[PDB]
Design a protein around this ligand. Structure first.
Ligand SMILES: CCCCCCCCCCCCCC(=O)O[C@H](CCCCCCCCCCC)CC(=O)O[C@@H]1[C@@H](NC(=O)C[C@@H](CCCCCCCCCCC)OC(=O)CCCCCCCCCCC)[C@H](OC[C@H]2O[C@H](OP(=O)(O)O)[C@H](NC(=O)C[C@H](O)CCCCCCCCCCC)[C@@H](OC(=O)C[C@H](O)CCCCCCCCCCC)[C@@H]2O)O[C@H](CO[C@]2(C(=O)O)C[C@@H](O[C@]3(C(=O)O)C[C@@H](O)[C@@H](O)[C@@H]([C@H](O)CO)O3)[C@@H](O[C@H]3O[C@H]([C@@H](O)CO)[C@@H](OP(=O)(O)O)[C@H](O[C@H]4O[C@H]([C@@H](O)CO[C@H]5O[C@H]([C@@H](O)CO)[C@@H](O)[C@H](O)[C@@H]5O)[C@@H](OP(=O)(O)O)[C@H](O)[C@@H]4O)[C@@H]3O)[C@@H]([C@H](O)CO)O2)[C@H]1OP(=O)(O)O
Ligand SMILES: CN1C(=O)[C@H](CCCCN)NC(=O)[C@H](CCCN)NCc2cccnc2Sc2c(Cl)ccc(Cl)c2CNC(=O)[C@@H]1Cc1c[nH]c2ccccc12
Lengths: 239, 316, 338, 238
């Protein structure tokens, strides 16, 4: 499975914020979408997710065009999305939170729905807090519950918005382990984040967007060696 | 499960909004009635009965508006707390969530039909009867302190009046016949320390005694006789009003989108003014249907115009 | 210290003006919709529209308090959500100074309220009444121990079908008289024709006598106490008090009129305290909704206490100024919490 | 000049979020207030600034008690504050933005007010954009204008809230240079930020707050060597 995005463009207030952004991603591959703040990475990410209507470009998923499909139709095709801000259903139980999305699956029945809920709870180690409301859980456990809920829909590509925001160095390792678990599950992860240092540590392929266009691409080492990103984005000294 | 979540949220918020709007509107009307009683034109003891009898008629308006505002608030909260984002990302669309609430919309439609077809005519019949009973007030019933009150051939002036409308002081009464009295207490009215004059005859007394429609008709009568434009208009307004619940549901679904920064309450005012546009169009198409100009068919059509307009808007 | 003051005053004044315009338009529209149910053969839709349009100054005058409230809410919400009040405080500018600037903004609305009440409303209201209907009859009055009835009175200074009864201090008839026509001559005295009289009969072709009725206040009788301007209300109340007993409704009108600017300022202060207090870090929609609720609550409380003043014994001053003082204290306390 | 904070405590929803937080700072000294997110650093910082009423503790500035003084009174004593989010007056010109705070100074007159405005504009290199509105300026220039406006009040201690949030690695050097310029000006800077790596690079003294109490203090090297912060906050690697 390969998600290909070609020649995206978007303008606000008669100013072209994004101009000819393009890249490709594959299942089981971690791709980073980085760049200077407000230079196009965030808008391009939201164009891929579907929150913002596209002004130009195309999106394909194995010869299946997602250009005109709405957000939920893309999600039905296998594109899950994890927002930066809290998104757990506040007044629903965590078990209820996961089961709500499990019930949307047409290819499951009650018994295997319950079995999948049990496996997700055990996998994310949130089983002991399964009976508590989402509004009364800590940040890390809430994020793990959100990720389990997202996986409940069986997405093929997961688009993460700022997974390392507000995360102390102690929990960055746990989040990296979680992302690597998603990779091992066969889900291609598209991460967008301000914390470039930790994002480049795991991403197998990275695209740098500046001035609304992609200026660099390749492995993190290739990105660090690139002179243009150093000049405009990373600076002379970075590791 | 998501259906029970949405239903619980919508019912709770809609009941809160219905209670709050009921409080606002009929507190305003209660204050107006209290002022009227303060002028002696109405018995302050029965105005609570008036509010109780007019309950159904104000609920007829509040329940659609309350349900609409509740739906708007619930979906605005869903958008603000990013729950709508994950629901969309799980394959559940906004229109799907709106459709999941159809049983609740049918329940509210049934409730409003009960209010429209039985409770509202009964309330407005009782209210009309009570108002007719209260409208025959005259003489000392309308007396005001330090003022001249004229009704029929009678005119009354009183210098003081207690918290209850009793125990008058400095009473002057004019027809030919004239009466003065140091005190009085209420047509059987006692007068204490008083004098009587004829205009020549004079008399004194330590104690003396004076002695001076379609909107309420039941649906049972109106279900037929459609040939008459007034009954046609009323019965059409009872039959086709309940579907404002469905129109409110679908238009709230159409207009509910709002970004987190804008807030939960951002799009309440424009949406409420669109709904009040529907209400006004309907309260107009009624007036006409009555004067035999537009015809009954205009009721569902108007709804359809506000229905389709929403259905298209939600699918842009 | 004028640049920050100028900025705050400009923002808040523009918010108030925009809110005032919007509310005036909405009230005109709603009043027309309400006055579209009383159409008659001689009263068409165009006549109703003209009647509502002529009533616009009155609606503006009645909307100024809530208009100022919502304007303060919106202006200070724009300032706060942009994190301008936090930096304003962080440079040493106190909360009370910002409230003072907002009160400077609201004084324009107070002045406009005075101008409308004393100059504009009594004219456009009369025009609207003339339009709707198209200088008093059957007027009873008292002068101490005398009772007077005038079947017709003309503000030009004429009376027709006069009857007068004069009583003794012990309420015994001192005299009675009738007259066909009468004409004011000097302050407190009228000539009249056909003076039938009886004393404790008599007739006269023409005779003068003293009664306190004056052409100046004849037209005021048919007008409600609330709709009278402050000058007219004060003059009429002084006349009535000096010659008879002033009704309690006129006292209620006087106390409600005198307390209007204080009500406006107190409501603005409550708005500012709410912005600095509970409504800090809230969506502008929620701020607007809470402002509307505060406005409705204030109007309902004012009306209810005015009526309770009429029903109950003590003076209307308490019933009118209690909410103002209580809301001022509540706002001051909420400002003390910072 | 030394700002001393002793035994702060604050509770929300009957839960003690901050318990016995204390530290000290001096003019011309950069102090970092770091720790796990939501562990007390943010609440303690806001208690020092004045946004949140204090439930316990005391604050002193050279034997002058700031405990009961309100936010603006503290600011009058020399405590400036730079919020994380945008705070430039949206509809006022940048020159007007600085002049508004300059006019609040009682010890200046028109001529030297204008001279100070000129020096601040030249110092922060925002002179060429002096005539544009705040709402129509870029992030870096807006932040520099905010810092110049804060300096216009002549604060003795500047409390910065997340100065490195949303800042690319290229501009982190410029922000560090700006902070060092404030230090050279004699203004003690109290920085609170999530980005511990860049904060420890410049801060001369750092306090780590965990579980609502201060668990470590000293130079950044001493903090990195501390075993407790490594166990709970920084992790085995860093
Ligand atoms: C289809 C399926 C089903 C769905 C649809 C079903 C059908 C729906 C309709 C049927 C059910 C309804 C039943 C009914 O019947 O509902 C009637 C009332 C509701 C009708 C609604 C109809 C549908 C409309 C669309 C619906 C959807 C929106 C009852 C009734 O209308 O009663 C009638 C009553 N009318 C009202 O009260 C209007 C009603 C209002 C309705 C008329 C306008 C309609 C606008 C429509 C759009 C609205 C959009 C939101 O007020 C009130 O609801 C009280 C306040 C309500 C507050 C609500 C707040 C909500 C928001 C809350 C915050 C978020 C009427 O008043 C007269 C005047 O008195 C005061 O001025 P005066 O003192 O005289 O100067 C008022 N001034 C006042 O109150 C206020 C003062 O000015 C102060 C000024 C400022 C106040 C407001 C400040 C803010 C303004 C702007 C806000 C945005 C004037 O206000 C007016 O002029 C109009 C004036 O702008 C007032 C406000 C108008 C707009 C609403 C604002 C509310 C607050 C919003 C805040 C966010 C008012 O005109 O007296 C009649 C009796 O007349 C007689 C008699 O017969 O004895 C003979 C007369 O000659 C005269 O003598 C009279 C005498 O006064 C003695 O009583 O007596 C009553 O007759 P009744 O019917 O027999 O009782
Ligand atoms: C003739 N009318 C009315 O008497 C309505 C219905 C009263 C009984 C409701 N149980 N009330 C009013 O006017 C009163 C004015 C008091 C005058 N003393 N308060 C305003 C109002 C209340 C309810 C609906 N609209 C309005 S104002 C309006 C609006 Cl919003 C839009 C268009 C139009 Cl033409 C009007 C003018 N009004 C009318 O056309 C109604 C028509 C009607 C007859 N039967 C009804 C039963 C239910 C609903 C409406 C009607």
């Amino acid at each position: 499975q390969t998600l290909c995005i070609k020649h995206l463009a978007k303008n606000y207030s008669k100013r072209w914020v994004v101009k000819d952004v393009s890249f490709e991603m594959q299942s089981g591959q971690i791709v980073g979408l980085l760049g200077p703040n407000g230079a196009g990475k965030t808008t391009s990410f939201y164009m891929v997710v579907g929150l913002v209507r596209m002004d130009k470009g195309e999106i394909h998923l194995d010869n299946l065009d997602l250009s005109d499909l709405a957000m939920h139709e893309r999600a039905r095709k296998g594109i899950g999305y994890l927002p930066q801000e809290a998104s757990i259903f506040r007044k629903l139980t965590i078990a209820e939170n996961i089961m709500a999305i499990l019930e949307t699956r047409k290819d499951l029945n009650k018994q295997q729905r319950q079995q999948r809920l049990q496996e997700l709870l055990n996998d994310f180690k949130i089983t002991h807090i399964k009976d508590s409301l989402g509004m009364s859980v800590s940040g890390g456990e809430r994020r793990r519950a959100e990720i389990a809920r997202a996986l409940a829909a069986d997405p093929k590509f997961m688009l993460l918005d700022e997974p390392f925001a507000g995360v102390d160095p102690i929990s960055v390792g746990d989040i990296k382990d979680i992302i690597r678990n998603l990779k091992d599950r066969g889900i291609g992860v598209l991460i967008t984040d301000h914390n470039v240092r930790e994002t480049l540590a795991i991403c197998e392929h990275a695209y740098i967007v500046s001035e609304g266009a992609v200026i660099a691409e390749g492995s993190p080492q290739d990105i660090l060696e690139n002179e243009q990103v150093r000049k405009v984005y990373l600076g002379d000294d970075f590791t | 499960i998501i259906r029970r979540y949405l239903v619980k949220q919508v019912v709770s918020t809609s009941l809160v909004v219905i209670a709050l709007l009921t409080l606002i509107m009929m507190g305003g009307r209660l204050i107006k009635y209290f002022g009227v009683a303060a002028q002696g034109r109405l018995d302050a003891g029965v105005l609570f009965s008036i509010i109780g009898y007019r309950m159904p008629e104000f609920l007829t308006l509040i329940l659609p508006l309350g349900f609409f505002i509740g739906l708007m608030l619930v979906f605005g909260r869903l958008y603000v707390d990013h729950e709508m984002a994950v629901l969309n990302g799980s394959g559940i669309s906004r229109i799907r969530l709106g459709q999941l609430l159809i049983p609740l919309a049918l329940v509210f439609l049934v409730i409003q039909g009960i209010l429209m077809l039985w409770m509202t005519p009964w309330g407005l019949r009782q209210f009309d009867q009570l108002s007719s009973s209260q409208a025959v007030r005259t003489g000392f019933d309308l007396v005001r302190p330090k003022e001249f009150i004229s009704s029929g051939p009678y005119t009354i002036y009183a210098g003081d009046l207690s918290e209850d409308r009793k125990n008058l002081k400095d009473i002057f009464f004019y027809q030919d016949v004239m009466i003065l009295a140091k005190e009085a207490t209420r047509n059987v009215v006692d007068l204490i320390q008083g004098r009587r004059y004829e205009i020549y005859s004079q008399a004194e007394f330590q104690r003396y005694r004076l002695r001076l429609k379609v909107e309420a008709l039941p649906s049972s009568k109106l279900w037929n006789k459609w040939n008459d434009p007034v009954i046609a208009s009323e019965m059409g307004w009872r039959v086709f009003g309940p579907f404002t619940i469905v129109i409110a549901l679908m238009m709230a679904v159409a207009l509910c989108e709002v970004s987190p920064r804008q807030g939960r309450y951002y799009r309440l005012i424009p949406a409420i003014f669109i709904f009040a546009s529907l209400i006004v169009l309907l309260i107009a198409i009624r007036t006409r249907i009555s004067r035999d100009e537009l015809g009954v068919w205009a009721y569902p059509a108007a709804l359809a115009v506000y229905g389709i307009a929403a259905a298209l808007f939600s699918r842009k | 210290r004028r640049i920050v003051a100028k900025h705050v005053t400009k923002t808040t004044a523009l918010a108030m003006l925009g809110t005032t315009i919007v509310l005036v338009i909405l009230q005109v529209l709603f009043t027309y919709l309400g006055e579209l149910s009383n159409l008659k053969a001689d009263y068409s839709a165009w006549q109703a529209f003209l009647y509502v349009l002529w009533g616009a100054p009155r609606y503006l005058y009645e909307i100024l308090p809530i208009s100022a409230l919502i304007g303060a809410i919106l202006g200070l919400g724009t300032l706060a959500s942009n994190s301008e009040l936090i930096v304003m405080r962080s440079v040493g500018i106190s909360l009370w100074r910002i409230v003072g600037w907002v009160i400077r903004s609201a004084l324009v609305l107070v002045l406009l309220s005075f101008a409308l009440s004393e100059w504009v409303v009594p004219y456009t209201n009369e025009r609207a009444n003339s339009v709707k209907s198209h200088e008093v009859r059957g007027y009873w009055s008292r002068e101490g121990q005398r009772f007077i009835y005038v079947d017709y009175a003309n503000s030009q200074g004429q009376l027709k079908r006069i009857q007068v009864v004069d009583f003794d201090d012990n309420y015994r008839l001192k005299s009675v008289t009738n007259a066909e026509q009468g004409q004011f001559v000097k302050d407190g005295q009228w000539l009249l024709n056909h003076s039938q009289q009886m004393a404790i009969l008599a007739n006269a072709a023409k005779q003068p006598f003293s009664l306190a009725l004056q052409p100046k206040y004849v037209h005021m009788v048919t007008i409600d106490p609330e709709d009278l301007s402050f000058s007219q209300l004060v003059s009429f109340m002084n006349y009535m008090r000096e010659y008879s007993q002033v009704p309690k409704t006129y006292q209620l009108a006087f106390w409600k009129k005198v307390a209007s600017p204080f009500a406006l300022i107190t409501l603005v202060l409550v708005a500012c305290s709410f912005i600095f207090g509970p409504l800090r870090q809230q969506s502008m929609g929620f701020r607007l909704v809470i402002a509307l609720f505060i406005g409705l609550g204030f109007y309902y409380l004012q009306d209810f206490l005015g009526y309770a003043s009429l029903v109950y014994n003590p003076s209307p001053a308490w019933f009118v100024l209690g909410p103002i003082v209580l809301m001022f204290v509540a706002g001051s306390y909420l400002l003390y919490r910072a």
